[PDB]
Design a protein around this ligand. Structure first.
Ligand SMILES: NC(=O)C1=CN([C@@H]2O[C@H](COP(=O)(O)OP(=O)(O)OC[C@H]3O[C@@H](n4cnc5c(N)ncnc54)[C@H](OP(=O)(O)O)[C@@H]3O)[C@@H](O)[C@H]2O)C=CC1
Ligand SMILES: COc1cc(Cc2cnc(N)nc2N)c2c(c1OC)O[C@H](C1CC1)C=C2
Length: 158
């Protein structure tokens, strides 16, 4: 499978100043669940944001930089390289990757953050005319997760 994995808010903000605008442990545990044992593909800036590879899965960074060679990370240098990765591949960010891949992926795992944040990076617009809701699960609120949020699994129609 080729999947998108993304959290975006009511206006499709994904980012601010190279960070997530929200603090939401549950969603990061969501990410852990989904992608552990599989492969994440991410652009260089996103990799730089996270700082190092995520444990217990394959980390692939897409970059133009041929100097790039990082302990625990596989480098690719074209979009086309994605399609030769074995396994369940998650497109993991950021704006540029999402824009490039959204028409290409089988399905999307979206966490809708039910707020409006200040952002400088965005998920591309999409229509539910194009995308079937395989599931929609309200995330649980509590002391440490205080933003309402919904896990969507969408699958391309037709
Ligand atoms: N909310 C969420 O689920 C997520 C949000 N984010 C947010 O997104 C923002 C980052 O997005 P964005 O600025 O687009 O950066 P990206 O993470 O998408 O990285 C951009 C870089 O990726 C490399 N790249 C992209 N496409 C190609 C290509 N076709 N060929 C070769 N290299 C390529 C380039 O690296 P280079 O210049 O080195 O060649 C490019 O500069 C951050 O604010 C982050 O917080 C990130 C992940 C998830
Ligand atoms: C841009 O910043 C992040 C993007 C992301 C990417 C990301 C976050 N959330 C969702 N739902 N999808 C995504 N693709 C993450 C993230 C980020 O900040 C650390 O944190 C954690 C990593 C283990 C430390 C996980 C994801």
């Amino acid at each position: 499978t080729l999947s998108i994995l993304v959290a975006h808010d009511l206006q499709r903000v994904i980012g601010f100043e190279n960070q997530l605008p929200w603090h939401l442990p549950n969603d990061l545990k969501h990410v852990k669940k989904l992608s552990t044992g599989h492969t994440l593909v991410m652009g260089r800036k996103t990799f730089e944001s996270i700082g190092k590879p995520l444990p217990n899965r394959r980390n692939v960074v897409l970059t133009s930089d041929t100097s790039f060679n990082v302990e625990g990370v596989d480098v690719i240098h074209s979009i086309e390289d994605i399609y030769q990765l074995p396994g369940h591949v998650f497109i993991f960010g950021g704006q540029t990757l999402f824009e490039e891949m959204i028409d290409k992926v089988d399905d999307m795992y979206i966490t809708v953050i039910e707020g409006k944040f200040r952002g400088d990076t965005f998920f591309p617009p999409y229509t539910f005319e194009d995308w079937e809701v395989a599931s929609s699960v309200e995330g649980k609120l509590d002391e440490k997760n205080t933003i309402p949020h919904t896990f969507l699994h969408l699958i391309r129609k037709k």
